[PDB]
């Protein structure tokens, strides 16, 4: 075409290159942190599962997405989205809680009525246990409790990876009557619950913190993707550019001279 078109191109790509990077490093910073800060959490949340581990409780009656509030700086949400609608088939009672508004976003799939609550903007200034407790607390109250389901969140895994998790979500003190419950004795539909609770909180927090971490690596990654792309793409054009540019000149010199040399 012309260099115009090209620059018009270039312009943006370059912009992009930067933008992507802005978005990248920032993301990475958040991410870096998010991970970092994740250590006690890691333990803690890993902790959360303590006995859910050593005996899961079954609910023949608690799906709950957990994502961030934004995405498309990755298909982060799409993973949970997947995993939650997929979930929803399986389930009982499907009333869902979306922590993440990128959860709201995906969920509308009979999941505008089947939300129970939604929690929001947990990224963009991080989530916390404070939050976690919040989401935890109110969640309970609602005649929705255990209805099985999952807590579907982005479980961070490594810088380069996370795998979006889904859980069994059980809180019926009753089947946590059954089994092992006895065995590691000291139990009551109190303490049960007041762990069930607490581990709901622990997880809720945890998961959430994973989620966000996963995203932060994912935006960063998305921004990765892009910039790598960007850079080549630029690379390519710029030549072609140049060429045509030169092409001009040359041609043009032609057109001019020897196009309007003695011959015109």
């Amino acid at each position: 075409a012309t260099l115009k078109d090209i620059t018009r191109r270039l312009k943006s790509i370059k912009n992009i290159q930067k933008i992507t990077k802005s978005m990248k490093m920032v993301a990475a910073a958040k991410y870096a942190r998010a991970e970092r800060e994740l250590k006690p959490a890691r333990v803690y949340g890993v902790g959360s599962l303590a006995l859910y581990e050593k005996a899961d409780i079954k609910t023949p009656e608690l799906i709950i997405g957990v994502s961030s509030d934004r995405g498309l700086c990755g298909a982060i949400h799409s993973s949970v989205a997947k995993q939650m609608k997929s979930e929803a088939a399986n389930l009982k009672e499907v009333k869902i809680i979306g922590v993440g508004d990128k959860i709201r976003s995906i969920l509308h799939r009979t999941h505008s009525d089947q939300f129970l609550v939604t929690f929001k903007e947990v990224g963009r200034r991080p989530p916390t246990f404070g939050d976690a407790s919040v989401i935890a607390l109110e969640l309970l109250n609602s005649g929705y409790e255990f209805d099985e389901g999952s807590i579907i969140f982005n479980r961070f895994r490594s810088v380069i990876s996370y795998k979006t998790e889904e859980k069994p979500i059980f809180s019926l003190d009753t089947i946590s009557s059954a089994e092992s419950m006895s065995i590691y004795d000291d139990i009551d539909a109190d303490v049960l619950r007041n762990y069930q609770e607490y581990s709901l909180a622990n997880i809720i927090y945890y998961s959430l913190k994973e989620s966000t971490t996963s995203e932060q690596s994912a935006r960063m990654t998305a921004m990765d993707n892009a910039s790598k792309n960007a850079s080549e793409m630029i690379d390519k054009l710029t030549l072609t550019f140049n060429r045509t540019r030169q092409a001009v000149i040359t041609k043009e010199l032609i057109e001019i001279i020897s196009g309007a040399a003695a011959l015109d």
């Binding site: 922590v99 508004d101 903007e121 200034r125 989530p127 939050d131 407790s133 935890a136 607390l137 609770e197």
Partner: protein, 47 residues
């Protein structure tokens, strides 16, 4: 169910207040981190 599970009270509800009360306790130095470590950017909707 007594006063932190009141008649009701989440163990959370309680708990968080406990912990919060701990946060309230302690020194300030630490409390900078406190709320920071117990945000609740959890804005809420039902949908």
């Amino acid at each position: 169910v007594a006063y932190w599970r009141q008649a009701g009270l989440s163990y959370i509800r309680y708990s968080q207040i406990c912990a919060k009360a701990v946060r309230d306790a302690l020194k300030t130095e630490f409390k900078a981190n406190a709320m920071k470590t117990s945000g609740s950017t959890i804005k809420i909707v039902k949908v």
